[PDB]
């Protein structure tokens, strides 16, 4: 299997490339020495493209034949807390985001959006997180590619426990193998985050569970997107499953995690 937005054709085989950005590459750095390198792709470095820097990472889909791909964004914030101090200082109105409200809900906006014809970034990511299963329990599906060629990102409204277990359900389709080696490495996952050096001292966010599976039954799930991963003040720690209020800079990672792990466990005894 191969990947190949952000992403460029790696030269080695089983490598590809992801533009690199300093707050991720940082992360990836820390994290080849942390308890979660296993839980993350490989990071070799950085390389030059055409004038440009590259992450060089493991290709996820290379070890599998024709794979299935499910994208599970974890937490139940999905920005970053100096996005609401610059929405009330000086907020940049985003006419794309009222679009993109507007085409999945046009009574979503406020008398005042309307008449902006825009909204700010913090208050489409909340909505976002609210329509959505991240607010309530702690995670949200952003997509799927099947081994048919087929993709779907259609996942805006997917919000009640039942809803996502039934994307799960076709996701898996059937293969008690799959799913069996899915909840092995979750619980698996959720051990190295409860005693991660990194997890403890970062705020985690905008950052996914990439699923991949194959007919062959192979399973595997890794973190993946370190883009808006911040080290928090030293000596400052996060427990990852309390609620979020402006200033604690909890992100329910945990509570995501839980709740993902509970989904899987009652599909497995359907
Ligand atoms: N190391 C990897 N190997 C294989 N596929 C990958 C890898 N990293 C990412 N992908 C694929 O690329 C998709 C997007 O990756 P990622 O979320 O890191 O990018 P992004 O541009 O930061 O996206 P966003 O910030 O909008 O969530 C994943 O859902 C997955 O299909
Ligand atoms: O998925 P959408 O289109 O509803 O919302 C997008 C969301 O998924 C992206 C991932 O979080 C988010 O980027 P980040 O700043 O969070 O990295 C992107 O923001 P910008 O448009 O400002 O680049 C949103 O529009
Ligand atoms: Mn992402």
Same mark, same amino acid.
């Given at each position: 299997?191969?990947?190949?937005?952000?992403?460029?054709?790696?030269?080695?085989?089983?490598?590809?490339?992801?533009?690199? &950005?300093?707050? *991720?590459? +940082?992360?990836?750095?820390?994290?080849?020495?942390?308890a979660?390198?296993?839980?993350?792709?490989?990071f070799?470095?950085?390389?030059?493209?055409?004038?440009?820097? +590259?992450?060089?990472?493991?290709?996820?889909?290379?070890?599998?034949?024709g794979?299935?791909?499910?994208?599970?964004?974890?937490?139940?914030?999905?920005?970053? *807390?100096?996005?609401?101090?610059?929405?009330?200082?000086?907020?940049?109105?985003?006419?794309?985001? +009222?679009?993109?409200?507007?085409?999945?809900?046009?009574?979503?906006? #406020?008398?005042? *959006?309307?008449?902006?014809?825009?909204? #700010?970034?913090?208050?489409?990511?909340?909505?976002?997180?609210?329509?959505?299963?991240?607010?309530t329990?702690?995670?949200?599906?952003?997509?799927?590619?099947?081994?048919?060629?087929?993709?779907?990102?259609?996942?805006?409204?997917?919000?009640?426990?039942?809803?996502?277990?039934?994307?799960?359900?076709?996701?898996?389709?059937?293969?008690?193998?799959?799913?069996?080696? +899915?909840? @092995?490495?979750?619980?698996?996952?959720?051990?190295?985050?409860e005693?991660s050096?990194?997890?403890?001292?970062?705020?985690?966010?905008?950052?996914?569970?990439?699923?991949?599976?194959?007919?062959?039954?192979?399973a595997?799930?890794?973190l993946?997107?370190?883009?808006?991963?911040?080290?928090?003040?030293?000596?400052?720690?996060?427990?990852?499953?309390?609620?979020?209020?402006?200033? @604690?800079?909890?992100?329910?990672?945990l509570?995501?995690?839980? @709740?993902?792990?509970?989904?899987?466990? &009652?599909?497995?005894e359907?």
């Open positions: 299997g191969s990947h190949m937005g952000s992403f460029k054709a790696a030269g080695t085989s089983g490598l590809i490339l992801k533009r690199c &950005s300093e707050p *991720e590459r +940082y992360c990836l750095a820390r994290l080849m020495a942390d979660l390198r296993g839980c993350v792709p490989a070799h470095g950085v390389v030059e493209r055409d004038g440009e820097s +590259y992450l060089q990472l493991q290709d996820l889909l290379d070890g599998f034949d794979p299935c791909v499910l994208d599970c964004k974890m937490g139940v914030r999905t920005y970053l *807390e100096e996005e609401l101090t610059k929405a009330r200082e000086r907020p940049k109105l985003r006419k794309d985001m +009222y679009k993109k409200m507007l085409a999945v809900d046009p009574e979503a906006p #406020t008398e005042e *959006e309307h008449a902006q014809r825009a909204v #700010t970034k913090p208050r489409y990511m909340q909505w976002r997180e609210g329509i959505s299963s991240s607010t329990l702690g995670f949200r599906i952003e997509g799927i590619k099947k081994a048919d060629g087929s993709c779907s990102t259609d996942f805006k409204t997917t919000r009640s426990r039942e809803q996502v277990l039934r994307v799960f359900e076709e996701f898996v389709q059937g293969d008690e193998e799959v799913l069996r080696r +899915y909840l @092995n490495r979750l619980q698996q996952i959720r051990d190295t985050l005693v050096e990194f997890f403890r001292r970062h705020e985690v966010i905008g950052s996914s569970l990439l699923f991949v599976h194959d007919h062959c039954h192979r595997g799930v890794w993946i997107d370190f883009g808006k991963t911040t080290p928090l003040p030293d000596g400052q720690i996060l427990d990852h499953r309390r609620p979020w209020e402006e200033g @604690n800079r909890e992100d329910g990672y509570l995501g995690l839980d @709740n993902l792990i509970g989904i899987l466990a &009652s599909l497995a359907r």
